């Protein structure tokens, strides 16, 4: 059944699993027309498919051409997501195929179950966790490859950089979710915290800065403070 606080360590066991987030698949700017009506313009999107144990991120870029001449795009976006995840699973060798796919939004369950009928042994699960994967487009290198795409494209990343050399998957996932939670709550503040000290750089093959163990503790402290402040403000507590 559903993934929650109670069955959290299952994410870091040796059963292959993927999180799928569809929140950045269909993206629009809303604008006024000459006649003063409102219209949308689609912009490039992405499926965020993540192995939480390894950090492997399968970023399927969704080019605006896929929406051309289609109706009910928010509904189509769920089915396109399920079609692309299904095509990804079929592209992987049998020993690399996931035993579970966890969708971050319940509306993905039926589209994914129907696209994966060929894989009756792959469990399709919801989660009660409120995961901040919508903030993936606040990671500058991910945002850049999506916005420059001129055609459909799959790009592979490790969202943990080299952290797994020093920390466990559990700890790597906790750092990732804290960084994304910060970026989602106050993007400008979060990005100031990450880049303020120009001596710490982002390696060409990495997404995040090259912090020491000590500098990560300070960074992680600054992100928790950012999140609690914004909470007090949101709620006047």
């Amino acid at each position: 059944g559903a993934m929650n606080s109670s069955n959290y360590a299952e994410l870091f066991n040796n059963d292959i699993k993927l999180f799928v987030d569809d929140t950045n698949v269909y993206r629009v700017t809303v604008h006024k027309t000459f006649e003063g009506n409102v219209a949308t313009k689609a912009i490039n999107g992405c499926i965020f498919t993540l192995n939480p144990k390894t950090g492997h991120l399968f970023l399927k870029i969704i080019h605006t051409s896929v929406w051309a001449g289609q109706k009910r795009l928010s509904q189509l976006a769920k089915w396109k997501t399920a079609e692309e995840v299904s095509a990804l699973v079929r592209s992987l060798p049998k020993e690399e195929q996931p035993k579970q796919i966890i969708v971050t939004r319940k509306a993905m369950l039926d589209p994914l179950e129907v696209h994966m009928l060929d894989f009756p042994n792959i469990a399709i699960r919801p989660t009660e966790l409120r995961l901040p994967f919508s903030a993936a487009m606040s990671i500058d290198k991910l945002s850049d490859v999506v916005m420059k795409a001129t055609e459909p494209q799959m790009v592979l990343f490790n969202i943990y950089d080299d952290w797994l050399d020093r920390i466990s998957s559990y700890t790597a996932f906790s750092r990732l979710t804290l960084l994304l939670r910060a970026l989602k709550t106050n993007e400008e503040s979060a990005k100031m915290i990450l880049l303020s000290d120009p001596t710490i750089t982002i390696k060409s093959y990495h997404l995040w800065p090259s912090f020491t163990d000590e500098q990560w503790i300070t960074i992680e402290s600054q992100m928790r403070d950012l999140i609690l402040t914004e909470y007090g403000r949101k709620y006047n507590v």
Binding site: W79, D110, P111
Partner: protein, 300 residues
């Protein structure tokens, strides 16, 4: 007009014959049911006064043989049996009629209720859903499970309704996943009507049989089957116009007949709300929508 004699009534029981029912007392001189309309399938059903659990009964057609009921004190139930000796049977029935020990099938002349509930139901189709080929009649009860229920355990005593599953390879063509899931016309028209049922009459026949088993025996798997067959039609954008017109009539008489007090366990809120208000056919079932809105507005 045909007769189903009873050897005796040793135990106190509520006897149903189609939509009618009679209380019989322990050792009441009751010898059966006469004036049964020829031309239709019938069901004769039982609920013991001492165990209101296990409704059970027998689907039959008097054109297919001479049937009687006899209590079996070992198995503790009223059993249907065939009498092969035509003369012994006419002789038994004539005696019981002369002594007026039989209830009369109480049809009102104006009243087409039973025809309207059984229009497409044929004994030969009932005998394929309820497999017991040595009898010409079919036993059903409250507890019998469906082939589909057994997949999710004794196959001899199962209801072999056609398996409908909206999230199955049968229902969904590779490469038309979204199309076939949101518009079930492919599944209804090609797989089910052309492929399995052969025509809409057999489809309606199973639907009507599933409803009647749900209503008369509170058979939960039959209720699931009735709703699945409704939802497959209402979830198809493309349905022959005669099928929609006939489905509206079928469902109208089913909703009309359903006991008011059983609406809560026999009607699935999600299916009815979807079929009348969201589905492709939301504007195609005028009679059914009007009777549902006036009789069960709570459900909606």
């Amino acid at each position: 007009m045909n007769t189903v004699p009873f050897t005796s009534a040793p135990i106190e029981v509520t006897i149903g014959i189609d939509q009618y029912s009679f209380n019989v007392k322990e050792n009441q001189p009751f010898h059966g049911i006469k004036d049964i309309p020829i031309g239709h399938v019938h069901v004769i059903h039982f609920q013991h006064a001492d165990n209101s659990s296990m409704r059970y009964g027998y689907w039959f057609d008097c054109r297919m043989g001479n049937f009687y009921i006899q209590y079996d004190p070992k198995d503790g139930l009223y059993k249907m049996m065939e009498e092969r000796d035509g003369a012994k049977f006419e002789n038994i029935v004539h005696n019981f009629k002369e002594r007026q020990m039989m209830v009369s099938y109480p049809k009102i002349d104006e009243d087409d209720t039973w025809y309207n509930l059984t229009e497409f139901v044929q004994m030969d189709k009932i005998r394929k859903i309820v497999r017991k080929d040595e009898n010409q009649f079919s036993y059903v009860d409250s507890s019998m499970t469906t082939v589909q229920e057994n997949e999710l355990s004794d196959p001899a005593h199962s209801l072999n309704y056609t398996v409908i599953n909206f999230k199955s390879r049968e229902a969904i063509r590779p490469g038309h996943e979204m199309e076939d899931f949101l518009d079930k016309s492919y599944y209804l028209n090609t797989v089910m009507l052309q492929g399995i049922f052969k025509n809409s009459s057999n489809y309606f026949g199973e639907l009507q049989f599933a409803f009647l088993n749900a209503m008369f025996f509170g058979n939960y798997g039959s209720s699931l089957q009735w709703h699945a067959m409704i939802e497959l039609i209402c979830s198809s954008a493309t349905v022959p116009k005669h099928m929609l017109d006939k489905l509206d009539e079928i469902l109208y008489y089913q909703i009309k007949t359903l006991p008011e007090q059983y609406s809560d366990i026999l009607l699935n809120e999600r299916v009815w709300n979807i079929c009348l208000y969201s589905s492709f056919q939301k504007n195609s079932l005028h009679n059914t929508e009007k009777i549902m809105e006036n009789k069960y507005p709570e459900l909606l």
